[PDB]
Amino acid sequence: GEAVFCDDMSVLPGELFLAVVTSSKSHAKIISLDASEALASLGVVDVVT
Amino acid sequence: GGRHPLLGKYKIGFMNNGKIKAADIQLYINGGCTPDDSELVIEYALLKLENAYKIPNLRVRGRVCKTNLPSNTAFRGFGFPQGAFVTETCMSAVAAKCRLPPEKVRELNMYRTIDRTIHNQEPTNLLQCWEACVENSSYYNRKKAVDEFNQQRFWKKRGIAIIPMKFSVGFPKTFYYQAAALVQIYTDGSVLVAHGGVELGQGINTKMIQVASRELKIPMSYIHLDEMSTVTVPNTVTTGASTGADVNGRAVQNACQILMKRLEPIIKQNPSGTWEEWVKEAFVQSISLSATGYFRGYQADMDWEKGEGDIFPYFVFGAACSEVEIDCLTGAHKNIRTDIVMDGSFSINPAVDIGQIEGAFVQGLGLYTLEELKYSPEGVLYTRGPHQYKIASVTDIPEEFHVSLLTPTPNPKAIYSSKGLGEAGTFLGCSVFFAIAAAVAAA
Amino acid sequence: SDELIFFVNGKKVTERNADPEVNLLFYLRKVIRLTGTKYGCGGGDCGACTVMISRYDPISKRISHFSATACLVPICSLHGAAVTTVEGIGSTKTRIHPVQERIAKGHGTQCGFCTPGMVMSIYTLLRNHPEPSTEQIMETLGGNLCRCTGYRPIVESAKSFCPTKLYEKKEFQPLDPTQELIFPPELMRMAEQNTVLTFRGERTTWIAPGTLNDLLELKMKHPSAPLVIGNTYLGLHMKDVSYPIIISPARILELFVVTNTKQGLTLGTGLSLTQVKNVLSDVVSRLPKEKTQIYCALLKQLKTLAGQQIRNVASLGGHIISRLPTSDLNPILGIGNCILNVASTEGIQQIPLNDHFLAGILKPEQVLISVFVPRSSKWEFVSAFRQAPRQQNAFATVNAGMKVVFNTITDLGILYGGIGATVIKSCRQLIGRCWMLDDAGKMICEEVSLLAPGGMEEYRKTLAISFLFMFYLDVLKQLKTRDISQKLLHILEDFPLTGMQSFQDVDFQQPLQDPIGRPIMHQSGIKHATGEAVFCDDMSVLPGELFLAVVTSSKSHAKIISLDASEALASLGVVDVVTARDVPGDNGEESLYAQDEVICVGQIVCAVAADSYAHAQQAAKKVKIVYQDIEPMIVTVQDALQYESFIGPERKLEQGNVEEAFQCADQILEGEVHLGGQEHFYMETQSVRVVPKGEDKEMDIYVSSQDAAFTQEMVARTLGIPKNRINCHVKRVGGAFGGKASKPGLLASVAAVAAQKTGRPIRFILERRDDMLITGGRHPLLGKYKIGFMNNGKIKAADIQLYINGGCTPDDSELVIEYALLKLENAYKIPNLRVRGRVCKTNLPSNTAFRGFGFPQGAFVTETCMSAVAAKCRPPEKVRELNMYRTIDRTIHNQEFTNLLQCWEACVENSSYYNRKKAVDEFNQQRFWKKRGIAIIPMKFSVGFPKTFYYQAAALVQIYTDGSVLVAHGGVELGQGINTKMIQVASRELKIPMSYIHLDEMSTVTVPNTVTTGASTGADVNGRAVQNACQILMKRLEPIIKQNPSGTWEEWVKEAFVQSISLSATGYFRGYQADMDWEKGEGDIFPYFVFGAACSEVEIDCLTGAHKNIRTDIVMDGSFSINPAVDIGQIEGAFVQGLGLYTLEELKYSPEGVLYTRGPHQYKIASVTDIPEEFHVSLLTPTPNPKAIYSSKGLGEAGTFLGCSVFFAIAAAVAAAREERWAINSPATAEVIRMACEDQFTNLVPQPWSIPV
Ligand SMILES: Cc1cc2nc3c(=O)[nH]c(=O)nc-3n(C[C@H](O)[C@H](O)[C@H](O)COP(=O)(O)OP(=O)(O)OC[C@H]3O[C@@H](n4cnc5c(N)ncnc54)[C@H](O)[C@@H]3O)c2cc1C
Ligand SMILES: Nc1nc2c(c(=O)[nH]1)N[C@H]1C(S)=C(S)[C@@H](COP(=O)(O)O)O[C@H]1N2
Ligand SMILES: Nc1nc2c(c(=O)[nH]1)N[C@H]1C(S)=C(S)[C@@H](COP(=O)(O)O)O[C@H]1N2
Ligand code: MOS
Ligand code: FES
Ligand code: FES
Ligand code: NA
Ligand code: NA
């Protein structure tokens, strides 16, 4: 367990963790994209589009 | 995404003795919603689907039909396990219609003399692997026991299958083959290697050390490798097409040679000294101990309009004989024995390569027997995870698994007459498929 | 309560767990992680940590903006204020501020470590006065220190803010004062109820009350608790005292009161010293001059006391209660019959501030609420006096306070500072005496003689009287002016407070985008001004990363009987204590960790690795170890000669026959000169971080060094692992000047092993006081000479003998003495010359390289002969151009091949030497108690290591397929701009714009087996390596630029790749041929020579010994500089280091060789007001030097020796003094000079703490 893979690296002060929301539809226009709840959620720093 | 599903449409004109005279085969593959490596897949599946067989009159067409599914990309075998499987579905189909034995129909249409691929590129120890496989497996003896078993058993049946294989390796353009290295020698005698390949578990890093050990003639332990980085080797190419260590092997070899030649005068004034004394004196005498290597790549080119060209530097020949027992009542089956002969030709690391074959064989196995992806009418992925996506476990692989490399043989093109076996094993899994297929028939 | 609330850069910081001990500077860097503002000491002396604090006064409605030292600012005192750091006013990520721009493009920046503090010392000034005068610019800068640039390019950039070429002034952005950050309104509402705030730490609780009742209450309940406002005292004194309770009277209004009414001025305790300044100027200006005698005395003292930062925080109260022995304000406050208004929980009270209030007088339970200082009666006079190593920002050697009331003497009183352990009959005898001096001189002389550390008694007593005189005349003047030789009248005129850089331009035909010869700004220049440059310490702390502290030998030479650290290991958050038995392999001819004995008074004996540096500092101080002194003990070189203790053999150089030439010589001269040592004083103290990559013993090391390779092996040999396991990185260094060559390799190893046993990353950063102790500096040098000369000045023979104190380990010593000997001849042909030198070793810290590497030391002795001989004969420059080289000639080691004369000639012109010397001579005829001197010194320097392989160098240049290039070489950026140059080079040979090219760092991963960045050859050797990499590559694109000869660099590379042409290439330089054979005493070492010369001029104050540097001119052969702006900076800077070595900088040791002067507070480097206020530099017309790349010439160390022009400028003043009424020792300080000029006063007492080494 001494082999450091990618995730095994220490977290740096300030290092952030990423999660992505994906299309639940096969082929579709995107009428509305509201993330207002997200940005406010606990310990979120930014939503990127 | 993953490997490209593939629908095959074929017409086989054959003679009554099994020899196939003509084949008009048509391939399509679901590429998903973006190009990615798709187009190169269908190019490749087409080039290689002929496999080990000379069909004197053969037309094959293929197009990448795109859909609203996630974007598909490369996968061990890159189009060959997909396209080859269709041509094998003809040899057993024809053998069926004839009522002739499968391996009989297979060694009728298999290459004999020096010949040419469907793209006009041009010896053959393919037969050797086949022959050796026919022996090491005792194919004819066991097929007998199988036949008997089928006469004793009704609600249960067995099947045995032996499949030939002519695979090949490498990208379809010269510049895709280039590779680099930067080898460093510090004044304490320790060496730091660094190249363009990337360790994925197939042991590139290990090999480059083996190489560095030859050309510097110091023990592997003097040599060390940190990582791959764009700081040390600029403008590199993906680690793929089973050529990883062929190309980098050459780059690293080039770096070592260049260096050694620089220590030439140093190993003359003290011809019996130690590697350590040499380097210290190199430094004191202003000889540079920083050197970079490079490999322009193997000449390869293809012209799709004329439909002919020389792409692959060499070929990998192999074959496998697998055997199974299916439970006619539930559909389940167990893999009993499997034998594999594969032309490795002076492997650079017998333990590494053998591992490649063993592994790649199982991925092959899962593709044809166990692994399933399923989508709803509107193309949403049902099977998301291990709980629903079943890869082979310890109890799925043939409990008697033998692998053997053909006696070493010249392949002067590649470094040290080696041969990249990375993707090789995959196609040979369909031996378990056609092992199963014959059980069903007998049922 | 409990929640600490303040704003950083307009962002709201709210700290729920505040610790009364953490200061702002730690908070910014370690917790908010704004690494922009940095610490280079901690004494509040260097301003390197300057920030700006803004305060809203709700009662006044005012928004104040003042600068402060963050290292001393307790975050617990920021509640409700705002803080702005360097990355608050601008950054390349958004947009940069005019101040950050003009400082970078104007080249007010080299190493970049001192810059954020300059920016913020200037910004502040703008926020207050957007169109500032110069007197204000000088006030705001008085408190920033720089060791590289010389202050010229910085000052000049500041000056740009009011009403050939190195940069383009016209492209600067304009200042829009209304564009700045807007004081946070949250803080405004917050300032409009009153209730106690209390913060609890690990060891200390901070209580700040909101009413005087509660303050008085806490004092009585906690009479031990100190009252902290400035913390410019508790900050220092505390460091190892810790208080369980601290009180902040800040919020108490009754302590900030100023009532000017009627018969006296009443000042509240809390008023800062800035606030006292402004209030005392407002009052003195609206009052008659008979009533303001003492206000103008305080004013006179306040103007030079510390810098702006410190006066902005230091309190009137704090200043008084702490009664420093050398306080400048106390000695006058007390001689004016001032009054302290104190209040305890019992009641009001007033105690006088009299001569003995400064005992060895407030009760423990009372607080100072304000001081009453009365207007001056019509017939009384008061006067302040002062003497300091530098005009401002440094304590008085001795200061005085004096008063009289009449011309018969009705009353009298005098308070001194700098002699008694505190501020200390003779005046009482003088009541009724007419205005008596000669009498009072004898009286004061015996008196002060009766009433410590510091040494130099003679000088301190001489000043004490010298101020008597000054007071004598100061008052006789007001007496004649109310109802007197001119030669006397001068002494009452004090010295106030203090160029064109020229080069040949670049060829008309040379394209814009070829940057060679072009004054390109230091590529990191802007980043230096924005605080984006990541130095070593600026790196984030990794989870688990540990901090290192080391305990060092407090004895010079001793066995180590017992070493007990049991308390340590147990102390809070310590993870391990590492000793000599923890070194896995080799431990060092010098040892990382002391074994058995200790051989020097700074040797590290062990190290403790805690989870915080504070936890490691306060643990290491509780390690116990006992010594058994080992007599024999060797410190002075004069010792190491008796005990015949040396390093390496004697080295001798001879030409001609000195024994025979001595008889045919008209005159003979014998004597000796001593030279002081010197501390590098890089602003970035030694720093390293060791970080296990967690596998195969591999590890990254980010170190502040001049030699990363050395470090590399020094660690792999300590741990016993292959070089290939440790990758050593260095992106930049905050200064070096040689002191980071050997040392960091050792200190890295010390930490390397701590990382072994702990099994984790170790961060090892030395505080300055330790840095000055552990790492040593330049080799002091004693000179013994015999000069046979003729009556006309021509020197026929010289038998000169050098020794240098090398310390307790070899290091680079032996190479120093070799070098000092080779170069000491300088510009002079002494037809018969013998010179010998040996490195005598002692029990002092190990000395190492320093800019000039032996030449400023040895050259100074030969110059001491030219002026000695000139003296015996009765003009200096005449004797100098008699013995100067003429034709093609040979050095004392037989090497051959002169536009030295040109520099001299040109210097004789550009300075108008002969015209000014005339004015000087006249001045000396007009002036007695003051004298001037002028001096012009030639110089033949040279460069490079003494063996061919030492010159090699490498590079690895990379070209990606988008056209961008990544360079990497063996040199290391220390602020002299190697990195910048290598880009200029890469630009020539690839013929792409600099902007296409980029350089990351130096690393042993990319360029193996490198040599230290030294001997002034850095860019010569690497310049060649990088050139070689580019060429090799271009040649490979040859066919590609033919098939498309008119294409774009971008299309070329893409096609190179597609056609299998390698874009990865390495360069190499075998080095310049150099060899030396010490037995035959001859060889060719240096590839070329650097010729130059300087003319400086000064005015010394015969009464105090002080002096100001008036003008200085420098001509130096640069010969097609590669970057006129870079080189000129080198010369300007290196000149000032030279200056400090010969005039200001002092190291002092006790008889047993312990280092007295540990830090900025005691170690004085040149500040803005020390350098010659008129400073001109010019490179001689370009001239072929085909050996070096592009006919360039390394000017790194050049300027240093040329400082002694100020030395010999001073030396001639002294003579002219003594004449109307030798061989001077290197540091010619206020002491030495004052004594040199002997008068009625110096004849009163004749003559330990310090021994010159
Ligand atoms: C770089 C530097 C240069 C300097 N140069 C000079 C110089 O040239 N000449 C010179 O004379 N001085 C000089 N000083 C000294 C400086 O003036 C003092 O540090 C300052 O006056 C003390 O104020 P403070 O509030 O910081 O004291 P603090 O550190 O806050 O504390 C002073 C002491 O007095 C007590 N105290 C504080 N306030 C009160 C109160 N209201 N009532 C009762 N007790 C109180 C505290 O308990 C504490 O023990 C220098 C200082 C520095 C850092
Ligand atoms: N363990 C392991 N083996 C592996 C792979 C991998 O990802 N992991 N990739 C396969 C594929 S798709 C390729 S192209 C080859 C690459 O072999 P080379 O890098 O030696 O050319 O490794 C093969 N074997
Ligand atoms: N700003 C700055 N100037 C400096 C130094 C430094 O570290 N910073 N080092 C000095 C010393 S001792 C040397 S040897 C040279 C090194 O520069 P080079 O590599 O161009 O010779 O810069 C000199 N001037
Ligand atoms: O050689 Mo520079 O470190 S005195
Ligand atoms: S760090 Fe605050 S002045 Fe040196
Ligand atoms: S630039 Fe000011 S210290 Fe280097
Ligand atoms: Na695709
Ligand atoms: Na030494």
CB atoms < 10 A from the CB of B90, how many?
A: 21
Does C184 sit behind a cis peptide bond, omega within 30 degrees of 0 on the bond before it?
A: no
Nominal resolution (angstroms): 2.5
CB atoms < 10 A from the CB of B384, how many?
A: 10
Q: How many residues does chain C have?
A: 1253
What is the four-CA torsion angle of C239, C242, C245, C251, rounded to 10 degrees?
Answer: 0
Hey, CA dihedral for C102, C104, C106, C110, is it positive or negative? positive
Q: Do B382 and B281 share a domain, yes or no?
A: no
Q: Do C879 and C913 share a domain, yes or no?
A: no
As for how many domains chain C has, the answer is 10
Q: Do B113 and B187 share a domain, yes or no?
A: no
* Alpha carbons C723 and C719: distance in angstroms, whole number: 10
| The amino acid at C1143 | T
CA distances from C280 to C264, C298, C301, C330 (A): 12, 8, 12, 16
Structure tokens that stand for C408 in this block: 């018969």
Letter string b/e over residues C874-898, b meaning 16 or more CB atoms within 10 A of that residue's CB: eebbebbbbbbbeeeeebbbebeeb
Chain B residue with minimum CA distance to A27: B68
φ, ψ of residue C792 in degrees (nearest 5): -95, 0
> Parallel, antiparallel, or unpaired: how do β-strands C339-343 and C264-268 relate?
unpaired
Q: Is C1138 in the pocket of ligand 3 (CB under 6 A)?
A: no
* Alpha carbons C123 and C133: distance in angstroms, whole number: 14
Q: Å from B71 to nearest chain C CA?
A: 27
Count of CB contacts below 8 A, B vs C? 105
Contact yes or no for C966 and B294 at CB 8 A: no
Q: Do B317 and B388 share a domain, yes or no?
A: yes
A26/B contact by beta carbon, under 8 A: yes
- Tell me the catalytic residues of B: 423
Q: Residue C956: exposed, middle, or buried by beta-carbon count in 10 A (0-12, 13-18, 19+)? A: buried
Q: Do B187 and B285 share a domain, yes or no?
A: yes
Looking at ligand 2, which atom is closest to the CA of residue B78? Answer: 12
Q: Residue A3: exposed, middle, or buried by beta-carbon count in 10 A (0-12, 13-18, 19+)? A: exposed
- Please name which of C1073, C892, C1047, C1037 lies closest in space to residue C965, comparing C-alpha atoms: C1037
- Please name which of C650, C707, C666 lies closest in space to residue C971, comparing C-alpha atoms: C707
SS3 of residue C941 by DSSP:
strand
Q: Do C309 and C427 share a domain, yes or no?
A: no
CATH value at residue C655: 3.30.365.10
Q: Do B337 and B228 share a domain, yes or no?
A: no
The answer to whether the CB of B323 falls within 8 A of the CB of B433 is no
Q: What residues in C contact B185, CB-CB < 8 Å?
A: 1008-1009
Element (DSSP H or E) covering residue C312: helix C308-313
Angle at C210 between CA C207 and CA C212, to 5 degrees: 100
Q: Do C397 and C470 share a domain, yes or no?
A: yes
CATH value at residue B168: 3.30.365.10
- Please name which of C738, C899, C900, C878 lies closest in space to residue C825, comparing C-alpha atoms: C900
Q: Do B413 and B429 share a domain, yes or no?
A: yes
Q: Which residues pair with B389 in a beta bridge?
A: none
SS3 of residue C18 by DSSP:
coil
SS3 of residue C179 by DSSP:
helix
Chain C residue with minimum CA distance to A8: C694
Of the residues C88, C119, C145, the one at which a domain ends? C88
Q: Do C260 and C146 share a domain, yes or no?
A: no
| The amino acid at C606 | C
Element (DSSP H or E) covering residue B132: helix B126-136
Contact yes or no for B68 and A24 at CB 8 A: no
* Alpha carbons B169 and B78: distance in angstroms, whole number: 10
Q: Under 8 Å CB-to-CB from C1212, ≥6 apart: which residues?
A: C867, C876, C933, C934, C935
* Residue C854 zone, left/alpha/beta (φ > 0; ψ -120 to 50; rest): left
Structure tokens that stand for C1141 in this block: 């070595």
> Parallel, antiparallel, or unpaired: how do β-strands B6-14 and B20-30 relate?
antiparallel
SS3 of residue A30 by DSSP:
coil
A12/C contact by beta carbon, under 8 A: yes
* Alpha carbons C1244 and C446: distance in angstroms, whole number: 9
Of the residues C53, C88, C123, the one at which a domain ends? C88
* Alpha carbons C817 and B162: distance in angstroms, whole number: 84
* Alpha carbons C1029 and C1037: distance in angstroms, whole number: 13
- Please name which of B78, B80, B66 lies closest in space to residue B35, comparing C-alpha atoms: B66
Q: Do B105 and B136 share a domain, yes or no?
A: no
Letter string b/e over residues A8-21, b meaning 16 or more CB atoms within 10 A of that residue's CB: eeeeeeeeeeeeee
Q: Which ranges in B10-120 belong to alpha helices (H)?
A: 38-48, 80-98, 102-109
CA distances from B40 to B9, B63, B309 (A): 20, 11, 15
Closest ligand, as measured to the CA of C1135: 3
Structure tokens that stand for B430 in this block: 């369909």
C759/A contact by beta carbon, under 8 A: no
* Alpha carbons C1132 and B371: distance in angstroms, whole number: 75
Letter string b/e over residues C371-410, b meaning 16 or more CB atoms within 10 A of that residue's CB: bbbbbbeeebbbbbbbbbbbbbbbbbbbbbbbbbbeeebe
SS3 of residue C1147 by DSSP:
coil
* Alpha carbons C706 and C1011: distance in angstroms, whole number: 9
Give residue C930's Cα distance to chain centre: 29
- Specify the residue with its C-alpha closest to ligand 1, atom 51: C232
Q: Which residues pair with C402 in a beta bridge?
A: C383, C414
SS3 of residue C624 by DSSP:
strand
Of the residues C46, C69, C88, the one at which a domain ends? C88
What is the four-CA torsion angle of A9, A12, A14, A18, rounded to 10 degrees?
Answer: -10
* Alpha carbons C841 and C1253: distance in angstroms, whole number: 11
> Parallel, antiparallel, or unpaired: how do β-strands C795-805 and C197-200 relate?
unpaired
Sheet strand arrangement including C197-200: C197-200, C205-208, C245-247
Q: Which residues pair with C408 in a beta bridge?
A: C434
φ, ψ of residue B380 in degrees (nearest 5): -100, 140
Q: Å from C702 to nearest chain B CA?
A: 17
CATH value at residue C388: 3.30.390.50
* Alpha carbons C1145 and C1154: distance in angstroms, whole number: 18
* Alpha carbons B407 and B404: distance in angstroms, whole number: 9
For ligand 3, the distance from its centroid to the CA atom of residue C736, given in whole angstroms, is 7
What is the four-CA torsion angle of C976, C982, C988, C989, rounded to 10 degrees?
Answer: 160
* Alpha carbons B193 and B191: distance in angstroms, whole number: 6
Q: Residue C822: exposed, middle, or buried by beta-carbon count in 10 A (0-12, 13-18, 19+)? A: buried
Q: Do C1098 and C1219 share a domain, yes or no?
A: yes
φ, ψ of residue B243 in degrees (nearest 5): -110, 5
* Alpha carbons C149 and C1134: distance in angstroms, whole number: 8
As for how many domains chain B has, the answer is 3
SS3 of residue C249 by DSSP:
coil
Hey, CA dihedral for C740, C743, C749, C754, is it positive or negative? negative
- Please name which of B239, B149, B223, B241 lies closest in space to residue B186, comparing C-alpha atoms: B223
* Alpha carbons C947 and C1074: distance in angstroms, whole number: 5
- Please name which of C1090, C1092, C1094, C1091 lies closest in space to residue C1207, comparing C-alpha atoms: C1094
Looking at ligand 5, which atom is closest to the CA of residue C50? Answer: 2
Q: Do C1067 and C1097 share a domain, yes or no?
A: no
Structure tokens that stand for C994 in this block: 């600099």
Of the residues B300, B328, B348, the one at which a domain ends? B300
The answer to whether the CB of B413 falls within 8 A of the CB of B347 is no
Q: Do C569 and C584 share a domain, yes or no?
A: yes
* Alpha carbons B356 and C345: distance in angstroms, whole number: 88
Letter string b/e over residues B166-187, b meaning 16 or more CB atoms within 10 A of that residue's CB: bbbbbbbebebbbbbbbbbbbb
* Alpha carbons C991 and C968: distance in angstroms, whole number: 18
Q: How many residues does chain A have?
A: 49
* Alpha carbons C813 and C841: distance in angstroms, whole number: 9
The answer to whether the CB of C338 falls within 8 A of the CB of C371 is yes
For ligand 2, the distance from its centroid to the CA atom of residue B423, given in whole angstroms, is 7
Of the residues B272, B300, B328, the one at which a domain ends? B300
Q: Residue C1064: exposed, middle, or buried by beta-carbon count in 10 A (0-12, 13-18, 19+)? A: buried
> Parallel, antiparallel, or unpaired: how do β-strands C348-352 and C339-343 relate?
antiparallel
* Alpha carbons C231 and C21: distance in angstroms, whole number: 11
* Alpha carbons C620 and C415: distance in angstroms, whole number: 42
**Residue C227 annotated in ligand binding:** yes
Q: Do C155 and C81 share a domain, yes or no?
A: no
For ligand 5, the distance from its centroid to the CA atom of residue C324, given in whole angstroms, is 20
Q: Do C869 and C918 share a domain, yes or no?
A: no
Q: Do B89 and B15 share a domain, yes or no?
A: yes
Q: Do B250 and B296 share a domain, yes or no?
A: yes
Q: Do B179 and B260 share a domain, yes or no?
A: yes
The answer to whether the CB of B421 falls within 8 A of the CB of B357 is yes
* Alpha carbons C1199 and C1130: distance in angstroms, whole number: 7
CB atoms < 10 A from the CB of C1219, how many?
A: 9
Q: What is the CA radius of gyration of chain C?
A: 31
The answer to whether the CB of C1159 falls within 8 A of the CB of C1095 is no
Mutation for testing the A interface, residue in B375, B380, B382, B384 having most A CBs under 10 Å: B380
Q: How many residues does chain B have?
A: 443
- Please name which of C261, C256, C285, C260 lies closest in space to residue C272, comparing C-alpha atoms: C256
* Alpha carbons B78 and B36: distance in angstroms, whole number: 13
* Alpha carbons C370 and C256: distance in angstroms, whole number: 8
Instruction: Give me the DSSP letters along C865-892.
Output: HHHHHHHHH--HHHHHHHHB--SS-B-T
Q: Do B115 and B206 share a domain, yes or no?
A: no
SS3 of residue C1056 by DSSP:
helix
Q: What residues in B contact C956, CB-CB < 8 Å?
A: 182, 290, 292
* Alpha carbons C1230 and C1119: distance in angstroms, whole number: 38
Q: What residues in B contact A24, CB-CB < 8 Å?
A: 380
* Alpha carbons C964 and C969: distance in angstroms, whole number: 17
CA distances from C666 to C326, C662, C832 (A): 53, 9, 15
- C partners (3+ CB pairs within 8 A) are A, B
User: What is the extent of the structural domain holding C16?
Assistant: 1-88
Chain breaks in chain B (C to N over 2.5 A) after: 122
Q: Do C625 and C753 share a domain, yes or no?
A: no
Q: Do B165 and B309 share a domain, yes or no?
A: yes
Q: Residue A31: exposed, middle, or buried by beta-carbon count in 10 A (0-12, 13-18, 19+)? A: exposed
* Alpha carbons C622 and C577: distance in angstroms, whole number: 12
* Residue C817 zone, left/alpha/beta (φ > 0; ψ -120 to 50; rest): alpha
The packing angle between helices C152-159 and C134-141, to 10°, is 130
User: For every residue of C55-103, which 3-state class applies, written as one string?
Assistant: EEECCCCEEEEEEEECCCCEHHHCCCCEEECHHHHCCCCCCCCHHHHHH
* Alpha carbons C401 and C399: distance in angstroms, whole number: 7
Q: Under 8 Å CB-to-CB from B394, ≥6 apart: which residues?
A: none
CATH value at residue C196: 3.30.43.10
φ, ψ of residue B286 in degrees (nearest 5): 60, 35
The answer to whether the CB of C661 falls within 8 A of the CB of C796 is yes
- Tell me the catalytic residues of C: 1197
Element (DSSP H or E) covering residue C1211: helix C1204-1220
Q: What residues in C contact A11, CB-CB < 8 Å?
A: 543
C544/A contact by beta carbon, under 8 A: yes
- Please name which of C1104, C1122, C1091 lies closest in space to residue C1199, comparing C-alpha atoms: C1091
CB atoms < 10 A from the CB of C1097, how many?
A: 29
Q: Do C575 and C590 share a domain, yes or no?
A: yes
User: For every residue of B270-335, which 3-state class applies, written as one string?
Assistant: CCCCCHHHHHHHHHHCCCCCEEEEEECCCCCEEECCCCEEECCCCEEEEEEEEEEEECCCCCCEEE
The answer to whether the CB of C137 falls within 8 A of the CB of C125 is yes
CATH value at residue C567: 3.90.1170.50
Catalogue the E-assigned strands of B51-197. Answer: 57-65, 157-168, 179-185, 191-193
Q: Which residues line ligand 2 (CB under 6 A)?
A: B 76, 197, 200-202, 204, 239-245, 356, 420, 422-423
Q: Which residues pair with C340 in a beta bridge?
A: C351, C371
C31/A contact by beta carbon, under 8 A: no
Letter string b/e over residues C224-253, b meaning 16 or more CB atoms within 10 A of that residue's CB: ebbbbbbbbbbbeeeeeeebebbbbbbbbe
Question: Which positions 502-531 of C are in contact with A (Cβ < 8 Å)?
Answer: none
SS3 of residue C721 by DSSP:
coil
The packing angle between helices C98-105 and C152-159, to 10°, is 140
A28/C contact by beta carbon, under 8 A: no
Instruction: State the greatest distance between any 2 C-alpha atoms of chain B, in Å, as a whole number.
Output: 84
* Alpha carbons C447 and C864: distance in angstroms, whole number: 39
Q: Under 8 Å CB-to-CB from B135, ≥6 apart: which residues?
A: none
The answer to whether the CB of C590 falls within 8 A of the CB of C809 is yes
Q: Do C550 and C470 share a domain, yes or no?
A: no
The answer to whether the CB of C143 falls within 8 A of the CB of C306 is yes
User: What is the extent of the structural domain holding B115?
Assistant: 1-123
Structure tokens that stand for C1012 in this block: 């230290």
